[PDB]
Amino acid sequence: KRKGIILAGGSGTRLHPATLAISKQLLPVYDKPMIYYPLSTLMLAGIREILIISTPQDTPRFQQLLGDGSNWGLDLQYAVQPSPDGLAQAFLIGESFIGNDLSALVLGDNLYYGHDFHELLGSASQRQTGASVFAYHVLDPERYGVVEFDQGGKAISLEEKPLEPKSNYAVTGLYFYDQQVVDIARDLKPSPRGELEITDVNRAYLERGQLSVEIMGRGYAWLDTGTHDSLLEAGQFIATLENRQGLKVACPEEIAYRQKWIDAAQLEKLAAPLAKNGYGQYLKRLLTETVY
Amino acid sequence: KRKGIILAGGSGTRLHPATLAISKQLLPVYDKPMIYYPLSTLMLAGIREILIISTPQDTPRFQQLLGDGSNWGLDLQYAVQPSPDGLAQAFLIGESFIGNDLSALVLGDNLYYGHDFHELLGSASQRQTGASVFAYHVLDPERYGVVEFDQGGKAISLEEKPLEPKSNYAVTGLYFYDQQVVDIARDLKPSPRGELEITDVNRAYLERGQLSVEIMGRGYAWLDTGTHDSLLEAGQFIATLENRQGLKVACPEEIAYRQKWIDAAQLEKLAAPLAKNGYGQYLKRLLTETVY
Ligand SMILES: CN(c1c(N)n(Cc2ccccc2)c(=O)[nH]c1=O)S(=O)(=O)c1ccccc1
Ligand SMILES: CN(c1c(N)n(Cc2ccccc2)c(=O)[nH]c1=O)S(=O)(=O)c1ccccc1
Ligand SMILES: [Cl-]
Ligand SMILES: [Cl-]
């Protein structure tokens, strides 16, 4: 079975003053808190048992929003990150949560969208050995881990934030790991910046021949929310799809309902308190519409 | 083989004064003229032989932009629509262009986007009998043809712009027809509004048991450009994907290049005149990037 982890840590001061109010991942993308999207993403890969790592100060705030997840058929747990020592520390912090299980790590500020996303996540979640990551063509690969391919399409190198990228293929912030991830991670020492890097972990799988790098196609939307401009862009986007469709993106209640993790009576009950606004009215409509 | 048709007709005065300047389908969605999207859509379904129907006044303008299509591996032809007698008149006007072949009709102001769009269009283009259309969940099904399904998911009725819709499933403006389409069409008389309706044609296939209605999923983007607000929304959208990816949506040159309809020397030649701007630089980069 596969446990999940959301890294919803500090972005420091780089989005202040917006974020003096609350954590980045509490800020909304259009109509719902940023963290609903990566949560919804782990739910879509069929993952029910999730660890949220954030700062000591923001843990309670996430707790208040999300609880223990039992309202939605989930078991949500929390772990505090004291210092921003890199995202590969997620595995050490999360070491007893993980235990002997498989895992998935997602960034709390990435936004995914597209057709058959459920199936793309299934095929990486389905593999019970090695590691699986997604490469997505971007304008600015310097901002991310960057995968290099040989003429045959096989991954041959990874580099973290290179000043001179080998490709425009960025590694997305959504990752799948077998039971080897903790131990590889424990053998890491901090990078020149002073962080435990996810790229160093993925590289170790690569050298073992156990890294699968699947392409996320250009028909998928991968966005993030690292600047005020891009956050804004992300809101417009979702808003446009939602107002077009009469359907929501990353509605956790709906997803749990479609995963069969809660039933129509439980859904109606979550809808009860929110009946006056468009969101509770949306969850009520899902009881009596067939949506393909 | 399958011929294509683009209906890029009058929107009257309903977008004036923007459109006193030029036809709607000449207006740009972000960086390229509206008509590049439905053109690109027919190209993606593997269609090379295309009839553009527009007003007498706009035919030359389309001609000037697009030519005979031979620059892009296409054979583009033109036919004038004198009066706005409905979109089912496309088949009568287009009757000798169609001849004994299969066909596809697309609206000149619809925007499609998503993963495996190429494969969704292939599976309807592949069928050599009957008709195939796509139903897409929308907020406002009153604006469109609306398909009804039975508990099993089978189409059981179609209605044009109903005041009291049976579902939120709109029939998109992208349609595939066998050789029966002209004759069915010739048996149509104008609706109460005074138009030859596409819904009446699709209904006739439905009653013959020869209408396939495939769902276009919520992971696809279906947008249109009927109002100034929505046009604007469509531009933002495309712009967001393009600036994110460093990739274009509905670049006809690129598509013809990937269809193998033109070669790397022809592409370089189309790039030559546009070298100074971002678009010609984009076509040059496609000569030497591998894009999955
Ligand atoms: C639009 N997407 C989506 C989908 N596709 N669905 C339908 C669904 C729900 C569960 C498993 C497969 C499909 C849904 O109920 N809510 C959604 O937001 S999605 O696959 O692109 C998605 C799913 C979760 C988070 C972000 C996007
Ligand atoms: C993003 N899309 C797209 C794609 N997918 N491609 C790649 C491609 C090109 C030809 C056949 C299959 C895939 C492309 O070269 N240009 C594109 O705009 S698309 O399928 O959503 C599309 C294609 C044509 C018009 C509008 C969207
Ligand atoms: Cl794709
Ligand atoms: Cl879908």
UniProtKB/TrEMBL annotation, chains A, B:
Enzyme class, first EC level, given as a word: transferase
Sorted UniProt keywords: Magnesium, Metal-binding, Nucleotidyltransferase, Transferase
Main function: Catalyzes the formation of dTDP-glucose, from dTTP and glucose 1-phosphate, as well as its pyrophosphorolysis.
EC number: 2.7.7.24
SUPFAM superfamilies: Nucleotide-diphospho-sugar transferases
The protein's name in its UniProt record: Glucose-1-phosphate thymidylyltransferase
Domain Nucleotidyl transferase residues, every copy: 3-239
Family membership noted in the UniProt record: Belongs to the glucose-1-phosphate thymidylyltransferase family.
Gene3D superfamilies: Spore Coat Polysaccharide Biosynthesis Protein SpsA, Chain A
Molecular function via GO: glucose-1-phosphate thymidylyltransferase activity; metal ion binding
UniProt keyword annotation of rRNA-binding present: no
Coiled coil, from the record: none
Source organism, top-level taxon: Bacteria
Cofactor entry: Mg(2+)
Pathway membership, UniProt: Bacterial outer membrane biogenesis; LPS O-antigen biosynthesis; Carbohydrate biosynthesis; dTDP-L-rhamnose biosynthesis
This protein's record includes keyword Membrane: no
Reaction it catalyzes: dTTP + alpha-D-glucose 1-phosphate + H(+) = dTDP-alpha-D-glucose + diphosphate
